[model samples]
Target: QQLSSNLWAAVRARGCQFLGPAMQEEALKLVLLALEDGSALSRKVLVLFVVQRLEPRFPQASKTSIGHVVQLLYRASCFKVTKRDEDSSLMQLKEEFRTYEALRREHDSQIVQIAMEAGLRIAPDQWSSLLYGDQSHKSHMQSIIDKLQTPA
Candidate 1:
């Protein structure tokens, strides 16, 4: 599909559909690059597809790569955006929050923990809202960060 179109978006569309477990790294770089664009649907698709498909498909993916993904998510989530694209950006942020929460709760992988920590650094305000409370947002993130730091 890489040659399907000269346009990056066209190639990305096909990649999302045809990419398999073996293409985690290649697929992830595309996802990250695509995130820079303003297409809400595209970002949503890439984020969901990554967490839902890529993570499980390659559980042994390099810690550096996963950590970088975590870093990218944190950066993308911290936006003070405006209209026409606000809803899309908000949805994307919500998805990031949801993805991180799921990872912390279900997998607690080092990548997930590192991502949450980066989120805390990049967008603590989002945590206050996304984690569903007016208060305790700080405590909640700190609690998880502390837990993740501890040995299981």
Candidate 2:
């Protein structure tokens, strides 16, 4: 699909800025896929940007708003994705999904960098608690159950 003017504006308004060249290129690819009326190339790029944003080659945001399209699919099982899916509708709120660690690595990136070097894991729920006050984004529904991976 061709890019829409409205979608382009919304993406920029939502802090679509990426940290690295590779990240920037990948983000553009994913945007083409996820936007309500974006293209096939955009959809295909979804997974790449998301994972890149997750491991994030460069610095990231506590509430960074990129790679949400793919994140929502995972967020559904999550009790708390999007606050609700607003993927459609040109005039709507943009949703940003994050893991505990990504959300709350530390306002002080210095500490986070040190911890990363020390080897600490930052998951979604944990990050939410630290990132936002009493506001939980979503839990890791990666597993169907606590220990059992869901068999589709």
Candidate 3:
């Protein structure tokens, strides 16, 4: 609990920033865990900043670590994006769904493919949590199916 406290979390993240690329991969793992910690909104923003900023600053130690990040992203997206009580108009909900579809495509870059393959072992569990898993994004859904059907 102390580790997730606001002060300690801030210090740990700031220290990691100071360590920069020299920080160990374990530090990134800790930050990833914190993403799912249900912390204050401000801390969540900090955690997101640290992860995205740090990810591109250094090559992940291995493909496995990259996959770990991907899995965490799936979990974190569920935590952050789902369970919304947005109180939106119908148009707003459709727009949000389309935006999420585009966002998923953006994450499907080459490096993510390696991580995705390695992490597919646990990928099935994420479907229920996915923002675009409904019938609305039908063609986008078909695109995923097409990719799956392609020769590997």
lDDT leader = 1
Instruction: Report the lDDT of model 3 for residue 104.
Output: 49
TM-score per candidate, chains pooled? 0.24, 0.22, 0.23
lDDT of model 2 at position 79: 19
Model 1, span 75-141: residue lDDT tens = 4343223347545533233333333344333222332343444343323344333333354455655
Task: Give the runs in model 2 whose Cα sits over 4 Å from its true position.
Answer: 1-16, 35-88, 91-152
Our tally of clashes for model 3 stands at 0
Off by over 4 Å in 1: 1-27, 30-38, 41-44, 60-86, 90-152
Error of 2 at 134 (Å): 44
lDDT against true structure, model 3: 0.36
The root-mean-square deviation over C-alpha atoms between each candidate and the true structure, in angstroms, is 17.0, 16.5, 16.8
1-152 per-residue lDDT for model 2 (tens digits): 12223323333344333233344334433343343342222323444545455445535522334544233332222212222255521211122323323222211132223234444544445433332333344343212122232346
lDDT of each: 0.40, 0.33, 0.36
Candidate 2 accuracy as TM-score: 0.22
Error of 1 at 148 (Å): 30
lDDT of 3 by residue, 2-31 (tens): 312432233233221122224333434444
lDDT, candidate 2, residue 72?
Answer: 30
Query: Number of backbone collisions per candidate, in order?
Result: 0, 10, 0
